[PDB]
Design a protein around this ligand. Structure first.
Ligand SMILES: Nc1ncnc2c1ncn2[C@@H]1O[C@H](COP(=O)(O)OP(=O)(O)OP(O)(O)=S)[C@@H](O)[C@H]1O
Ligand SMILES: [Cl-]
Length: 314
């Protein structure tokens, strides 16, 4: 009577039904759940996510050391939800946002709702209220850590409160997020759990481990920094995939850079040691020269984007 593959699928099906699609998956499964997404700003990360971007109506955690590139991704996500006509909100407990930098990443600052709460409770309630209006495509909360409880803020001499705070708010908010379809990005700067990163680990549909890995030099001097993101949790597509990309000083994710990495790995652009070539024409010697080439030769790149796009999904 026993036929494993048969029994297994019956079990997996039963599992998803009882707990939700994505409760169990084969790591190599080719996901076919289009959903609705907010492109990450990084083509590769969109691919790593398996669905083309951050899922809508879900809790997203983006953690890692400072200057890891978390905020950049958050800002790009906002920029993209806006181009699609979405409205964005920013719950700020850090007072670090640099609107001029955000504009550069394409964010329409003037339309950005910003709120600087007095307490963690207040910050999450304001977020809950904004979300339940169903009017937002995305909402980013700067600093899970910054969400300190009112009592602490007022000198209360008694603990476990800030994590409990993140739990209860997350319990209430997820419902509205799904109904509204608003993607909520919690930025968690570390020094995976910043007091309340505890409940966030379970409530999230996606958790991004962001980390700096290399300083982009090309020549002796610095041009920017390369970031590596690992999708440690993904309840909508097989997890653990990884992605890398360049964020040049004063710029967001380098599109050209992403086109040069995927293009090389997917054979569209050949790379003999030190020289990048594309179907019968030189791009230059050195990751950076190629970037320069693609920045200028806008016609190229678009086709390379085209090809890389078609090859996976546009
Ligand atoms: N205001 C800015 N002005 C110029 N460059 C910036 C600015 N913000 C970010 N960048 C660029 O992107 C990098 C920092 O990215 P962030 O997303 O701010 O890092 P992070 O991981 O979010 O660190 P935290 O704790 O949020 S600051 C910088 O090293 C620059 O390359
Ligand atoms: Cl994107």
């Amino acid at each position: 009577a026993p036929d494993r593959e048969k029994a297994l699928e019956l079990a997996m099906a039963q599992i998803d039904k009882n707990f939700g699609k994505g409760s169990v998956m084969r790591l190599g499964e080719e996901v076919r759940q289009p959903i609705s997404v907010i492109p990450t700003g990084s083509i590769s990360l969109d691919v790593a996510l398996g669905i083309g971007g951050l899922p809508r109506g879900r809790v997203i955690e983006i953690y890692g050391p400072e200057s890891s590139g978390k905020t950049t991704v958050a800002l790009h996500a906002v920029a993209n939800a806006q181009a699609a006509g979405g409205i964005a909100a920013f719950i700020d407990a850090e007072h670090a946002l640099d609107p001029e930098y955000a504009k550069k990443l394409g964010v329409d600052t003037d339309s950005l709702l910003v709120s600087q709460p007095d307490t963690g409770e207040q910050a999450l309630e304001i977020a809950d209220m904004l979300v339940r209006s169903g009017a937002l495509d995305i909402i980013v909360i700067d600093s899970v850590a910054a969400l300190v409880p009112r009592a602490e803020i007022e000198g209360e001499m008694h603990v476990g409160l800030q994590a409990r705070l993140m739990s209860q708010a997350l319990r209430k908010m997820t419902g509205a997020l799904n109904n509204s379809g608003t993607t909520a990005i919690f930025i968690n700067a570390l020094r995976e759990t910043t007091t309340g990163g505890k409940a966030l680990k379970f409530y999230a549909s996606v958790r991004l481990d962001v980390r700096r890995i290399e300083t982009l030099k090309d020549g002796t001097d610095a041009v920017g920094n390369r970031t590596r993101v690992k999708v440690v949790k993904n309840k909508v597509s097989p997890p653990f995939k990884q992605a890398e990309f360049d964020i040049l000083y004063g710029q967001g994710i380098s599109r050209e850079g992403s086109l040069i990495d995927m293009g090389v790995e997917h054979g569209f652009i050949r790379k003999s040691g030190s020289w990048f070539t594309y179907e019968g024409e030189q791009l230059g010697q050195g990751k950076e020269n190629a970037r320069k080439f693609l920045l200028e030769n806008t016609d190229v790149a678009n086709e390379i984007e085209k090809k890389i796009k078609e090859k996976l999904g546009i």
